Design a protein around this nucleic acid. Structure first.
Ligand SMILES: [Mg+2]
Ligand SMILES: [Mg+2]
Ligand SMILES: [Mg+2]
Ligand SMILES: [Mg+2]
Ligand SMILES: [Mg+2]
Ligand SMILES: [Mg+2]
Ligand SMILES: [Mg+2]
Ligand SMILES: [Mg+2]
Ligand SMILES: [Mg+2]
Ligand SMILES: [Mg+2]
Ligand SMILES: [Mg+2]
Ligand SMILES: [Mg+2]
Ligand SMILES: [Mg+2]
Ligand SMILES: [Mg+2]
Ligand SMILES: [Mg+2]
Ligand SMILES: [Mg+2]
Ligand SMILES: [Mg+2]
Ligand SMILES: [Mg+2]
Ligand SMILES: [Mg+2]
Ligand SMILES: [Mg+2]
Ligand SMILES: [Mg+2]
Ligand SMILES: [Mg+2]
Lengths: 99, 117, 106, 65, 88
RNA sequence: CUUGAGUCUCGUAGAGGGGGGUAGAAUUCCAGGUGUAGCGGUGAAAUGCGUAGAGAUCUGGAGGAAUACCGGUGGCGAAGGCGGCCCCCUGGACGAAGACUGACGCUCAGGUGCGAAAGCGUGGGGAGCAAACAGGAUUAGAUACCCUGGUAGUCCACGCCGUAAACGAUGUCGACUUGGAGGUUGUGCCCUUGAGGCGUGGCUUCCGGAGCUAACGCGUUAAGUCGACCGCCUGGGGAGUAC
């Protein structure tokens, strides 16, 4: 379907499987997701994660590192959850909400 | 109108809205503002900026009750938890603890079917 | 003629009613040719969550070796008595005559 | 790791609240053997003992009470 | 299944000695004892199909043991099937 | 005769099965406390809900269905399948050491039973979910996808149905043939003993050798080397259709 509708739905699903089904102590901080933008093809998607812990890079760096290392696990969960064709490749990014 | 000086803020952070309500420690509510009722609709109805706007609009309606000590309980992993938290933190309030209290069942009821989009 | 661990809680408002029920049940299970290998009265304890809007329930433990009939009418009495709020009957392959961790603190 | 094998306990008492509290979180949910290093047999025994203790109100189901 | 006392008594009864647990007679006797006992179980748990699979297996193996006995020496076979009230 | 196949003894692990209880979250609803104009929903919207006071929040109650965490590149079962806890009835598997029976074995047309889900008959139940349907939208078109509702059904009892990409797309049984890394469950012996070391079984996952294969790949749980029996195939369509 349209990339933005799939973007909204995938934001919902990533937020869900990010709040509940994680066990990495590197993650935490009520990690939210501001949104996710994906290409016209649904093959690739970029998530904009927003952390809470102090914005000091020592921690948000570790958070994005853990997310990128668990991307395979999150992709498997997404593929079983949200019922689409290709299970896009995920790329996490710190959304600098404070500007 | 009275003095409690120690309240708790429920933050229902839906994927389409954000409902912040400050209540007495025994569940009796005081006031509330919504991301929708803050002059936002559609997408902006569920954006973090509108969430903090609603948080501040709700704080401005309970200040006459005289509180600056809060525990907050968030529900729903919607965008607009971070926002309202830092908002009511920037509203001169002292937050002692923030707690995830989203209702998670032990396989209670069957969820609605996935959207084919 | 199996071994059972029977742990039940009593309404705290009937705390002194406990030894009566204790000796009554032991008499019932012994008059049925069933031994009793342990009996601990942990007494009043603070619950980990409310039970009928209540805390501070009276815990009591028993270890029996008895036939199944006496055990089933015992749990029947448990059900139809209201001073007990919650009971639990489990099986054991052996006989346990030791100190429960709720009496080693004492 | 594998503390229960060192203990050699045949079974884990549900009455051993002091021991069981080391295998649940503040939330009150059981901790996976993946991080506690518990043998699978003793992890099953832990799950059963903890569920029994929860029933007898010796341990909380959740932290919401 | 059968309790230790029941099996010990049946072995002592149909067997040659106390430790003749392998003879076809004691095997058939144990099987028919367990079958008769399981009849009461299946009288009320009539949709317990897995236990019924086990029961049918033991019925079948009793049948083939009886056939082997009848082919080995018919005298003992008839004496047994009359002491147990079978094959009718 | 005892090596195959069984019986006994002592134990072990298991969501194996049937029955009956019970617990704690959550959804819904009903009644109250607090508290006021939005809630809900979408890529945007409206249908919908609320000034009779919703939504949000706390307390209490009713009811139904399913059992988070544990949870596993786990376990059990002939397969289908099986997941809170407790009791009762019950099936199978495995191990150690013996004792016993003495080929009692393997396979199996016809036959018999079991057999997801949907469906059918009778009665009950009905929270959530949801074919059909009723709307709201979108669209050239929407009888779809999306949204708000929503009946059968999903649940229980007793019968019927007997089909699935019912799959490992791999029939059952037995023997034999280099390795390596794991999981799981027994068990023997030894060390100062827990710890640890050296063994030895069952089940199971993943690499890979010879060999095999059209290739992909399989590879001691074979698709390798053999034996026993059974099922089945003979170009595509017509057609798993007609009679
Ligand atoms: Mg949205
Ligand atoms: Mg047997
Ligand atoms: Mg079971
Ligand atoms: Mg009702
Ligand atoms: Mg058994
Ligand atoms: Mg001989
Ligand atoms: Mg046939
Ligand atoms: Mg059905
Ligand atoms: Mg019909
Ligand atoms: Mg029907
Ligand atoms: Mg009906
Ligand atoms: Mg619906
Ligand atoms: Mg077929
Ligand atoms: Mg299947
Ligand atoms: Mg086939
Ligand atoms: Mg073979
Ligand atoms: Mg198996
Ligand atoms: Mg291979
Ligand atoms: Mg072969
Ligand atoms: Mg081939
Ligand atoms: Mg042809
Ligand atoms: Mg036909």
């Amino acid at each position: 379907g349209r990339p933005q509708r799939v973007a909204q739905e995938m934001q919902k699903e990533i937020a869900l499987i990010l709040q509940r089904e994680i066990k990495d102590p590197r993650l935490g901080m009520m990690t939210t997701v501001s949104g996710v933008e994906m290409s016209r093809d649904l093959a690739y998607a970029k998530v904009y994660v927003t952390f809470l812990n102090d914005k000091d890079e020592d921690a948000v760096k570790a958070g994005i590192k853990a997310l990128q290392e668990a991307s395979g696990f999150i992709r498997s969960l997404l593929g079983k959850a949200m019922r689409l064709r290709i299970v896009p490749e995920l790329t996490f990014f710190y959304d600098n909400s404070l500007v | 109108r009275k003095q409690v000086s120690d309240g708790v803020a429920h933050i229902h952070a839906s994927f389409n809205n954000t409902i912040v309500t400050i209540t007495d420690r025994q569940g009796n509510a005081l006031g509330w503002a919504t991301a929708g009722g803050s002059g936002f609709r559609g997408s902006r109805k569920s954006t973090p900026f509108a969430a903090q706007v609603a948080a501040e609009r709700c704080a401005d309606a309970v200040k006459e009750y005289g509180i600056k000590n809060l525990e907050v309980m968030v529900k729903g992993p919607g965008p607009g938890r971070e926002s309202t938290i830092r908002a009511l933190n920037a509203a001169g309030f002292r937050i002692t603890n923030i707690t995830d209290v989203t209702p998670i069942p032990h396989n209670g009821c069957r969820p609605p079917k996935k959207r084919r989009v | 003629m199996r071994h059972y661990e029977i742990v039940f809680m009593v309404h705290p408002d009937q705390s002194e009613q406990v030894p009566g029920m204790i000796e009554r049940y032991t008499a019932a299970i012994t008059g049925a040719e069933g031994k009793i290998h342990r009996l601990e009265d942990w007494g009043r304890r603070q619950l980990a969550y409310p039970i009928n809007k209540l805390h501070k329930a009276h815990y009591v433990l028993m270890n029996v070796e008895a036939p199944q009939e006496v055990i089933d009418e015992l749990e029947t009495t448990f059900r139809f008595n209201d001073a007990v709020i919650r009971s639990m009957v489990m099986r054991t392959k052996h006989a346990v005559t030791e100190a429960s961790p709720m009496v080693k603190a004492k | 790791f594998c503390r229960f094998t060192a203990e050699g306990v045949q079974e884990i008492d549900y009455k051993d609240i002091a021991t069981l509290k080391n295998y649940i979180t503040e939330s009150g949910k059981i901790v996976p053997s993946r991080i506690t290093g518990t043998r699978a047999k003793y992890q099953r025994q832990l799950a059963r003992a903890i569920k029994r203790a929860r029933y007898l109100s010796l341990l909380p189901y959740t932290d919401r009470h | 299944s059968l309790s230790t006392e029941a099996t010990a008594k049946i072995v002592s009864e149909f067997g040659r000695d106390a430790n003749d647990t392998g003879s076809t007679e004691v095997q058939v006797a144990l099987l028919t004892a367990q079958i008769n006992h399981l009849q009461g179980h299946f009288a009320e748990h009539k949709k317990d199909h897995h236990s019924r699979r086990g029961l049918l297996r033991m019925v079948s193996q009793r049948r083939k043991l009886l056939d082997y006995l009848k082919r080995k020496d018919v005298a003992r076979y008839t004496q047994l099937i009359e002491r147990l009230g079978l094959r009718r």
